Amino acid sequence: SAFSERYLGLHGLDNRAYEMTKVAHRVSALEEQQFLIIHPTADEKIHFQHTAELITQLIRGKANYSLQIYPDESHYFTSSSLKQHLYRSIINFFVECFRI
Amino acid sequence: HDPEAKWISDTEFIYREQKGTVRLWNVETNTSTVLIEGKKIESLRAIRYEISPDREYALFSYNVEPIYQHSYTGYYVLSKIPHGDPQSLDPPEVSNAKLQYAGWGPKGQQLIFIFENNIYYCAHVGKQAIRVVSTGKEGVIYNGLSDWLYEEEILKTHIAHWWSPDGTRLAYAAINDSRVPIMELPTYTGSIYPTVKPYHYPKAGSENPSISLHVIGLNGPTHDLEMMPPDDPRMREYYITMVKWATSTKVAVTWLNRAQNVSILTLCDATTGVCTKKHEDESEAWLHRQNEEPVFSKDGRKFFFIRAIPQGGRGKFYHITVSSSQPNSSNDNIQSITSGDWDVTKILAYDEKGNKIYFLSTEDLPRRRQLYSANTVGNFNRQCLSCDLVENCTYFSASFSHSMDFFLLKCEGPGVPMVTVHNTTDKKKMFDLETNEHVKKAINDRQMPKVEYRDIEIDDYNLPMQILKPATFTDTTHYPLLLVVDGTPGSQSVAEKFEVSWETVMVSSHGAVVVKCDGRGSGFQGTKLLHEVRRRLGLLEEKDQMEAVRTMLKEQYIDRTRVAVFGKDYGGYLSTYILPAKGENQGQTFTCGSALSPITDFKLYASAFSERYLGLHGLDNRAYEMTKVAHRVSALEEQQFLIIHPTADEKIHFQHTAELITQLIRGKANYSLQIYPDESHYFTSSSLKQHLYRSIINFFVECFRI
Amino acid sequence: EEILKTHIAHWWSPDGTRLAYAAINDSRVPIMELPTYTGSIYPTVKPYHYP
């Protein structure tokens, strides 16, 4: 709530400030973009439910994507191995999507 | 559009919908009577319809919200037999409510219905619902239904109640889950604060549900009487894998111990509830074929139960055994009616007015099923009734009537499926009940893949194997290899069944060949080639698959670079366990690998599956530390891999994937992943299924194309 | 995480004699349960108040 009401106002009275903020409006097209998501299962800041709703909307829109999931990890990756694997994974995804 | 007609009497069958209305046939001379019009479309789209046994009422089940493979809970509405006057079935003192199961009786208009695990019976349809049993409790105490473990693992269905032949008493199994451990599945879509869904899922090394059999009459006090199982020291924990009415008051019940190595078949009488032990069956590894119901004659004479006779070498095959009503305790009359290098898939019925027992069996090949008739007297003549009476299918499934004079036959592959009426007297084809004419023209509309077969032999074991090709093959072009396996016990991946799936579409369009090889541990192909996988589930059949690849890589028209594997459920393990690096040079066995709901830690799975094949859990059998592909999937240096798994899976819990993922993080191996939030494992909806079909081929096309 | 962004919620007096500390009641805050998989054979969700 402390973040939502800061930029969209108090909720509970149908302020009409959240319907357009859902990303499902823009992710409809996804013509040829090789999209990807990386998420930790136990994320305490941005809940897994956000990625779940995005995946549901993507399934409804029938787009192409790949997903990587960290099983029961925290948010900021205060483990050296976790950070190393994360940077390796993003470097990979970008190099296989930049290969010509 | 298969009507799947049911023989009401000696000369009539149900003839359910094929293109609309529900009509009743008469075998005498092509006589048809419409019982239900095309009003099911306007009857709120009744999903499943049944008729009263006296052919006087029709029951419609609609608005179904499935929760397991067969848990079609919904709304049940009765209606008059001609048409008109719908009436929503209701529980006592309650308005319309969702129903777990109602069913129909064998005679009259009497019916039962199960609401919130409580069976309420009505002898008269006009009579309101009355209380018959109330011990059931939501999710913990059942009555006539099966929980998850009993629904899909051992009983293989949700039918846990049996009607008496005269429609006088009901025999139901009550399941107690009070001491059964409870596991919750996450919800990611419900609301702003989604909550997990908890249900009783007995894992390996846990307490199985307490099953108690009970009988209740349909009149008077309806006092409940339970049947006492035997009391051997090694079967106190038991499963009621099967039960069948011997007569209207005598019932035959099967008890399989917790170690599932001893199965006692028993008679019980509902008047007093005591059970008279009949026979016991065991083996060196385990018991098998726990749901073959023996046929009990009109006079209660010798039932014909399939069991393990030694059958010479290659293990103890499964053949029929004759047993009288009251065999002497000194010695029974066990007699092998059938004998050969095969078994009997199912027994239809025995002609009481003669010697003609009809059964579907594998007399020709383990991968083909044929109808046959044997003689119950010393002749023992297994005559052909079907025995390839149709040139194309050579696959069969038959269903007889009360006199078994007239029976329905179904081909179902490799050609377009056939539905036909036939008689055991003349073996003449009066007319085809359903021909799938749309499928008949469609099979020639497009370029269907051509099928090939190549039997393999390893050590003293024979292994069927099947191949598909795009049927427009050119020797110059190279086509990649795709290997699909299941490997689960009691299955046959290499079958001639006709089917359209992602495999056929991919073979036709993307230009690839798919190969399926049956491995060790599969049934119907010798019980010796079944029991040898005790505590060694997975390694033998994957060795067989690797040998098949090495005997497929020799083709001049195929390339070693593009080789892919697929799996699902238990095969999800196999699709991950068949990726080594042979030697040092002959690496890159599988370029792109995929699996669905893979299992890696069998101790995180059902007790009835872990203990049955890998050994009893809780004893540290050490098969629970060697059947984990996590130590095998560790290497995976450069081969990219994919996992697809719904979030709300109940067959193989998503935890199995997540732990595996952690190993990959420790393994530092490339992988992909997809999810389906809050979706079951059986893909009820069409959109989800077609999305999965699109996704698998979209993944494969990139990993093959160069 | 959102407003204070500080681990500590108590402040010492300049003379080292008193403390100013904040007490937060979370009972009326709706509770979220984070799913757990790697935990055990029967993993349980971690519950906490997440407004």
Author numbering:
A (entry chain K): 688 to 787
B (entry chain L): 82 to 787
C (entry chain K): 233 to 283
Paper text:
Modulation of voltage-gated potassium (Kv) channels by auxiliary subunits is central to the physiological function of channels in the brain and heart. Native Kv4 tetrameric channels form macromolecular ternary complexes with two auxiliary β-subunits—intracellular Kv channel-interacting proteins (KChIPs) and transmembrane dipeptidyl peptidase-related proteins (DPPs)—to evoke rapidly activating and inactivating A-type currents, which prevent the backpropagation of action potentials. Here we report cryo-electron microscopy structures of the Kv4.2–DPP6S–KChIP1 dodecamer complex, the Kv4.2–KChIP1 and Kv4.2–DPP6S octamer complexes, and Kv4.2 alone. Thus, our data suggest that two distinct modes of modulation contribute in an additive manner to evoke A-type currents from the native Kv4 macromolecular complex.
To investigate how DPPs modulate the properties of Kv4, we solved the structures of the human Kv4.2–DPP6S binary and Kv4.2–DPP6S–KChIP1 ternary complexes. Owing to the flexible position of the large extracellular domains of DPP6S floating above Kv4.2, the overall resolutions are 4.2 Å and 4.5 Å for the Kv4.2–DPP6S and Kv4.2–DPP6S–KChIP1 complexes, respectively. The structures revealed that one DPP6S binds to one Kv4.2 in both complexes through their transmembrane domains, forming an octamer for Kv4.2–DPP6S and a dodecamer for Kv4.2–DPP6S–KChIP1. In the extracellular region, two DPP6S dimers float above the channel core. In the structures of the Kv4.2–DPP6S and Kv4.2–DPP6S–KChIP1 complexes, the DPP6S transmembrane helix hydrophobically interacts with the voltage-sensing domain of Kv4.2, specifically at the lower half of S1 and the upper half of S2. The structure of the Kv4.2–DPP6S complex therefore represents a distinct interaction mode among the potassium channel complexes reported thus far. Although the side chains of the DPP6S transmembrane helix could not be easily assigned owing to the lack of characteristic density, the Kv4.2–DPP6S structure revealed seven hydrophobic residues in S1 and S2 of Kv4.2 that face and potentially interact with DPP6S. In the Kv4.2–DPP6S complexes, the single-spanning transmembrane helix of DPP6S apparently stabilizes the structure of S1 and S2 helices because it simultaneously interacts with the lower half of S1 and the upper half of S2. The acceleration of OSI by DPP6S could involve the N-terminal intracellular domain of DPP6S and the N terminus of Kv4s39; however, both regions are disordered in the structure of Kv4.2–DPP6S and further investigations are required.
